[PDB]
Design an enzyme around this catalytic site. Structure first.
Site, PDB file in Angstrom:
ATOM      1  N   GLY A  74       0.830  -1.207   0.000  1.00  0.00           N
ATOM      2  CA  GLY A  74       0.000   0.000   0.000  1.00  0.00           C
ATOM      3  C   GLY A  74       0.856   1.244   0.000  1.00  0.00           C
ATOM      4  N   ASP A 101      -9.394   8.914  13.439  1.00  0.00           N
ATOM      5  CA  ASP A 101      -9.310   8.459  12.033  1.00  0.00           C
ATOM      6  C   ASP A 101     -10.046   7.129  11.784  1.00  0.00           C
ATOM      7  OD1 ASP A 101      -8.563   9.277   9.602  1.00  0.00           O
ATOM      8  OD2 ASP A 101      -6.436   8.641   9.776  1.00  0.00           O
ATOM      9  N   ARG A 119     -11.141   1.726   5.695  1.00  0.00           N
ATOM     10  CA  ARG A 119      -9.800   1.847   5.046  1.00  0.00           C
ATOM     11  C   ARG A 119      -8.663   1.840   6.100  1.00  0.00           C
ATOM     12  NH1 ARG A 119     -12.322   6.628   4.945  1.00  0.00           N
ATOM     13  NH2 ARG A 119     -11.346   8.073   6.412  1.00  0.00           N
ATOM     14  N   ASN A 120      -8.944   2.130   7.387  1.00  0.00           N
ATOM     15  CA  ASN A 120      -7.921   2.284   8.462  1.00  0.00           C
ATOM     16  C   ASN A 120      -8.078   1.172   9.504  1.00  0.00           C
ATOM     17  OD1 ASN A 120      -6.902   4.593   7.126  1.00  0.00           O
ATOM     18  ND2 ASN A 120      -8.160   5.993   8.297  1.00  0.00           N
ATOM     19  N   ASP A 146      -3.263   3.068  11.684  1.00  0.00           N
ATOM     20  CA  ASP A 146      -3.295   4.499  11.279  1.00  0.00           C
ATOM     21  C   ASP A 146      -3.415   5.377  12.540  1.00  0.00           C
ATOM     22  OD1 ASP A 146      -3.520   4.432   8.045  1.00  0.00           O
ATOM     23  OD2 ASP A 146      -4.718   2.742   8.840  1.00  0.00           O
TER      24      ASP A 146
HETATM   25  C1  LIG Z   1      -4.355   2.935   5.489  1.00  0.00           C
HETATM   26  N1  LIG Z   1      -3.938   1.948   6.479  1.00  0.00           N
HETATM   27  C2  LIG Z   1      -4.620   0.666   6.249  1.00  0.00           C
HETATM   28  C3  LIG Z   1      -2.467   1.803   6.474  1.00  0.00           C
HETATM   29  C4  LIG Z   1      -1.886   1.100   7.694  1.00  0.00           C
HETATM   30  C5  LIG Z   1      -0.378   0.993   7.645  1.00  0.00           C
HETATM   31  N2  LIG Z   1       0.149  -0.038   8.528  1.00  0.00           N
HETATM   32  C6  LIG Z   1       0.120  -1.332   8.205  1.00  0.00           C
HETATM   33  C7  LIG Z   1       0.591  -2.270   9.159  1.00  0.00           C
HETATM   34  C8  LIG Z   1       0.567  -3.585   8.871  1.00  0.00           C
HETATM   35  N3  LIG Z   1       0.052  -3.966   7.666  1.00  0.00           N
HETATM   36  N4  LIG Z   1      -0.091  -5.236   7.182  1.00  0.00           N
HETATM   37  C9  LIG Z   1      -0.635  -5.087   5.976  1.00  0.00           C
HETATM   38  C10 LIG Z   1      -0.825  -3.742   5.644  1.00  0.00           C
HETATM   39  C11 LIG Z   1      -1.467  -3.156   4.443  1.00  0.00           C
HETATM   40  C12 LIG Z   1      -1.912  -3.975   3.402  1.00  0.00           C
HETATM   41  C13 LIG Z   1      -2.585  -3.467   2.291  1.00  0.00           C
HETATM   42  C14 LIG Z   1      -2.820  -2.127   2.268  1.00  0.00           C
HETATM   43  C15 LIG Z   1      -2.443  -1.317   3.316  1.00  0.00           C
HETATM   44  C16 LIG Z   1      -1.782  -1.798   4.407  1.00  0.00           C
HETATM   45  O1  LIG Z   1      -2.819  -0.017   3.068  1.00  0.00           O
HETATM   46  C17 LIG Z   1      -3.593  -0.067   1.862  1.00  0.00           C
HETATM   47  O2  LIG Z   1      -3.471  -1.381   1.306  1.00  0.00           O
HETATM   48  C18 LIG Z   1      -0.402  -3.017   6.744  1.00  0.00           C
HETATM   49  N5  LIG Z   1      -0.347  -1.696   7.021  1.00  0.00           N
END
Ligand SMILES: CN(C)CCCNc1ccn2ncc(-c3ccc4c(c3)OCO4)c2n1
Ligand SMILES: CN(C)CCCNc1ccn2ncc(-c3ccc4c(c3)OCO4)c2n1
Ligand SMILES: [Cl-]
Lengths: 286, 281
Positions: B32, B152, B156-157, B170
């Site tokens: 991501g 937040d 999505r978070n 997040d």
């Molecule tokens: C927006 N938020 C969700 C970000 C969170 C950022 N911290 C983390 C921590 C651990 N992990 N393990 C997988 C992901 C991940 C996988 C696909 C995604 C992703 C994060 O963000 C979009 O697509 C992750 N992210």
């Protein structure tokens, strides 16, 4: 505002031109825009999906500044649709896209850079920087700090004319000739003056610092500043007096102008009037 | 300023609890990228004195990062080193001595809850959705008792980890009770109008999250621009009961969106309503 309000039914939106921290921009057409009969090709700025209050405040701020400013090298506002639907700003269409994009395409698209709109010389590059300087000179007279000056936030329009764009972060300095923010800004670290980064102070002199970075971007044909250097390293790197090196495609005079824009002491930096004069001298002598 | 002080502390302290040797970390594919920065899959050798390689998620600054993005990362480190809960994503460590700042985090193989629901043509029971809602409520209940406002909360978070366990993620905007960067359609009325954020504004956000869950990743207030939502909420409009949503579930949503923060449920009450749904098959 009746001076600016445009009928929504006379605007037709097409493909996305760009999307990012600045919001969303689409190519569009406007019917019977400002007395021009028939359709005019325009850009329309709007909020991206899942907009925050900050992005709505930035769209409105942009609207408010571009209502008041008019310069050949500042992108033109033509109107807005601000009633019964999403806020849309109708702007001057810049057919070549960002300066960064345009310069980068020139490494790849002939005739390219030569040391025809696709043929570039050092004369062309100095002219681009000179057009931007004149725009910024006017903006400083209007008591505006842009804060987000960068090759990605300049547009290249008909006749390869430079258009300063991205006014969302721009701020009035009519009192004290500085804009100060308690909290952390949204300007990429690598374009920020040292006093903006440590002390959260934005002036015309911090725009001069950012202009020096833009100068390095122009002569490198859209190079990435402080390449390989993590942004968090710039705190120590700048305070110990390090600056980017003279790039390969750069005169001594041009590099001296960059170094002058990155003086630690804001008052030792040149003003935009002096930058415009320095770029004029360089043009004429060559 | 405040950020130069935090950056410099972070590069100096070298806290042996948290500092992970960069040579023991192998970065893999991008999971991501966005406003939250960049996260990649990785392996970590001898993470927290675990044998062999632990699969991890590594969070780092994206291209052209602003002071805001760098502050969010350090701020995440600050908050997550103090919290521990099964439905809150874990911090395992940091790399602060060798190139870019990296945070080492629990890996969630299913990605975001939003992405996991929008691809559901996989099969979920209402019981599962209510399990998901309940798990998040448990994490939020634990955060509120620690006097942390998340600010937040959104589908999505939230991450989905092994065994479809919910993980709240997040923590960049989170604040310790004792700027305009949240999407308007998730914000409480008093956050929009007076810029107040409390547990009760997290509860409002939770109500929007319930609605995303029940619509298997729907888009809140569909086709209403955020600019208009200020007057629609002010005048007492709220989203209609969606298709495939019980009265009970929809009543819980509506209570999370009461104008008066004092009239919203607390997270213990939201947790209890989902515990009671559960036993009542
Ligand atoms: C927006 N938020 C969700 C970000 C969170 C950022 N911290 C983390 C921590 C651990 N992990 N393990 C997988 C992901 C991940 C996988 C696909 C995604 C992703 C994060 O963000 C979009 O697509 C992750 N992210
Ligand atoms: C980041 N900055 C440049 C956003 C500027 C936003 N306002 C405008 C105004 C007029 N025009 N006319 C063309 C574009 C455009 C073309 C390609 C792009 C683009 C904008 O953004 C990236 O690619 C435009 N944008
Ligand atoms: Cl613009």
């Amino acid at each position: 505002d009746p001076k600016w309000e445009f009928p929504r039914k006379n605007l037709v939106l097409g493909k996305t031109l760009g999307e990012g921290e600045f919001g969303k921009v689409v190519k569009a057409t406007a019917f019977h825009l400002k007395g021009r009969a028939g359709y005019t090709t325009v850009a329309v700025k709007m909020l991206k999906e899942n907009a925050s209050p900050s992005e709505l405040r930035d769209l409105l701020s942009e609207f408010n500044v571009l209502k008041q400013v008019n310069h050949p090298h500042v992108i033109k506002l033509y109107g807005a649709c601000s009633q019964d639907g999403p806020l849309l700003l109708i702007m001057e269409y810049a057919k070549y896209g960002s300066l960064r994009g345009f310069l980068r395409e020139s490494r790849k698209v002939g005739p390219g850079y030569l040391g025809d709109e696709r043929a570039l010389t050092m004369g062309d590059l100095i002219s681009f920087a000179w057009q931007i300087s004149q725009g910024m000179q006017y903006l400083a007279e209007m008591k505006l700090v842009h804060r987000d000056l960068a090759a990605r936030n300049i547009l290249v329009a008909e006749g390869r004319k430079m258009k300063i764009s991205d006014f969302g972060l721009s701020r009035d300095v009519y009192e004290e000739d500085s804009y100060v923010k308690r909290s952390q800004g949204r300007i990429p670290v690598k374009w920020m003056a040292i006093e903006s980064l440590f002390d959260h102070i934005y002036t015309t002199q911090s725009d001069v610092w950012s202009f020096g970075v833009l100068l390095w971007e122009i002569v490198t044909l859209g190079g990435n500043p402080y390449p390989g250097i993590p942004p968090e390293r710039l705190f120590n790197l700048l305070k110990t007096g390090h600056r980017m090196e003279r790039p390969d495609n750069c005169s001594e005079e041009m590099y001296r102008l960059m170094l002058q824009c990155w003086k630690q002491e804001p008052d030792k930096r040149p003003v935009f009037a002096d930058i415009s004069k320095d770029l004029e001298k360089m043009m004429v002598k060559r």
